[PDB]
Amino acid sequence: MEMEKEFEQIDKSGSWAAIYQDIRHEASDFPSRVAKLPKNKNRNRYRDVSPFDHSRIKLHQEDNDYINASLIKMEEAQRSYILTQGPLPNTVGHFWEMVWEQKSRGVVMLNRVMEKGSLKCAQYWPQKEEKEMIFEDTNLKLTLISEDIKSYYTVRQLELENLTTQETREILHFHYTTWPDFGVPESPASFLNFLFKVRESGSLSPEHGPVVVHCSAGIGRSGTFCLADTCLLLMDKRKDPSSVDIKKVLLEMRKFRMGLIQTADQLRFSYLAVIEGAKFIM
Numbered sequence: 001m002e003m004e005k006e007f008e009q010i011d012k013s014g015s016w017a018a019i020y021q022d023i024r025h026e027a028s029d030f031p032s033r034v035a036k037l038p039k040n041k042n043r044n045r046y047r048d049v050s051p052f053d054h055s056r057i058k059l060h061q062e063d064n065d066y067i068n069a070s071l072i073k074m075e076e077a078q079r080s081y082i083l084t085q086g087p088l089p090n091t092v093g094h095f096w097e098m099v100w101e102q103k104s105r106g107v108v109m110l111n112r113v114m115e116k117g118s119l120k121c122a123q124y125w126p127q128k129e130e131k132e133m134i135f136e137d138t139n140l141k142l143t144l145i146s147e148d149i150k151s152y153y154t155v156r157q158l159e160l161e162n163l164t165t166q167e168t169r170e171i172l173h174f175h176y177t178t179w180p181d182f183g184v185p186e187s188p189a190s191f192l193n194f195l196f197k198v199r200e201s202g203s204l205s206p207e208h209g210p211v212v213v214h215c216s217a218g219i220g221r222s223g224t225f226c227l228a229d230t231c232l233l234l235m236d237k238r239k240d241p242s243s244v245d246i247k248k249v250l251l252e253m254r255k256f257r258m259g260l261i262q263t264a265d266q267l268r269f270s271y272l273a274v275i276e277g278a279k280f281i282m
């Protein structure tokens with residue numbers, strides 16, 4: 001079926017939970033043996049969210065190459081994304097090592113450091129120009145260059161230096177600050193505006209490594225971001241935009257990381273975002 005009318009048909013019939021459970025039943029199951037080794041327990045935020053072995057990002061280290069991060073490679077859309085968990089106190093240095101080694105230009109952050117009164121990720125970037133951060137385990141230095149605070153999101157310019165080689169690179173930090181503590185946003189308008197700002201920066205384009213996107217577990221809000229982007233890109237590329245099947249795209253992405261889209265409300269919100277976004281593109 002088309003998307004907008006399939007949408008109203010699920011709303012009128014109140015069957016979002018049943019649609020979402022079908023997705024969960026059909027989703028791929030692949031081994032995640034490296035993630036479950038005992039030496040990696042403090043590298044994982046949640047025991048039930050692990051990268052598949054076949055698609056995990058490897059750190060360029062011989063001691064321990066493990067990080068909770070996955071490469072989602074979308075072949076028809078010609079887009080790649082790295083989805084990861086919010087960094088932990090003992091993985092902030094691994095996170096920036098990955099950004100460096102994969103040649104990423106942008107980092108997309110969809111959560112706040114504290115939500116619901118609990119810490120959802122580490123404070124992994126510097127908050128003042130004159131107070132830079134050094135990560136001694138991976139030999140990197142990170143400096144805040146500039147910051148632009150808007151009503152729904154903040155963009156930061158950062159400098160990452162590889163202290164071994166003295167090479168430097170500019171990283172863009174795109175921080176969506178207004179996702180509600182419970183539920184999903186009422187309108188997709190500010191999320192779409194944010195996605196378009198990431199696009200305009202060059203961070204999603206083939207001349208750079210894959211963008212790094214995260215929330216707390218790296219599957220819920222993060223899945224919404226890449227699902228919406230890929231679906232809109234396919235509607236631009238194909239002769240028949242109504243052929244784009246958002247459930248089939250989600251199942252393709254779930255071949256690369258488990259659990260993408262965590263609730264039936266997130267699924268409905270993804271439909272809403274693609275529907276509204278397709279009208280603005282034209």
Ligand SMILES: CC1(C)CC(=O)c2ccc(O)cc2O1
Nearest residue numbers: 146147148155156157172201
């Ligand atoms: C963060 C800053 C002040 C400087 C910068 O490089 C930049 C890049 C992208 C953007 O959307 C806004 C920006 O303003």
